[PDB]
Amino acid sequence: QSASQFTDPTTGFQFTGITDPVHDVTYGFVFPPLATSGAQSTEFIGEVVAPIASKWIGIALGGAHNNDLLLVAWANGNQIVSSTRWATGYVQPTAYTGTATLTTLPETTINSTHWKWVFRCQGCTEWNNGGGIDVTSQGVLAWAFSNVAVDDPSDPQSTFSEHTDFGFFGIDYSTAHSANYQNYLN
Ligand code: HEM
Ligand SMILES: *[C@@H]1O[C@H](CO)[C@@H](O[C@@H]2O[C@H](CO)[C@@H](O)[C@H](O)[C@H]2NC(C)=O)[C@H](O)[C@H]1NC(C)=O
């Protein structure tokens, strides 16, 4: 599948991403301006817009279960619980030990039918294994989905069972940058 540009109609934030038609989950990403000199920023802003039937959602930042930064989130009442994770060998991802700070942004909204997780991911383009994403080129993202609740929803590091579905999408990171990024942070 292929990402495209869309505007969130309530916040006005502009993202690049997809809606999975099976679970009707929207995934969106937006990056700060490309640097004219020096290194690129290592942060981005994302969102997951998920029906309440979605018990946990994962984003795989290099498109794979293994050897890449994973973001996991679920709703627990009127709060989003989230974490950064990492796996090798196809087992339960555990807490990531690198430098990546996930912050839930105030646009985050939980209503009677959906949870809309809007987040800032600092240090999320470069990982402590030396890998990461190249924000000037084309890559693959993946998502993972479960309709079964995690073992303990109040614990950000809760265990849980394997996803019931996963999927992939191509993204042109070069076109996912926004002049309005700094405004999204305010
Ligand atoms: C206990 C929890 C989990 C278990 C046991 C598990 C296990 C697995 C297994 C066995 C596969 C291969 C499935 C196949 O090809 O038939 C896989 C694939 C995948 N998993 Fe997980 N997973 C778990 C959680 C997660 C999480 C939290 C994420 C992302 C946030 C994730 C992302 C992926 C992705 C993107 C694939 C497909 C690409 C690949 O083969 O690497 N998984 N997982
Ligand atoms: C709960 O939140 C979702 C996501 O914002 C709302 O669904 C969206 O509603 C806007 C209109 O404001 C539409 O333009 C989008 O197409 C909708 N998105 C999705 C994923 O359906 C939803 O209406 C809210 N529900 C309630 C009861 O307020």
Curated annotation (Swiss-Prot):
- Where heme binds, per the record, is at H65, H163
Subcellular localization, per the record?
Secreted
Carrying Pyrrolidone carboxylic acid, the residues are Q1
- Annotated region Heme domain: where? 1-186
Function recorded in the entry: Degrades both lignin and cellulose. Oxidizes cellobiose to cellobionolactone.
Q: Which family does it belong to?
A: In the C-terminal section; belongs to the GMC oxidoreductase family.
Name assigned to this protein = Cellobiose dehydrogenase
Gene that produces this protein? CDH-1
Q: Which residues of the full protein are shown?
A: 19 to 204 of 773
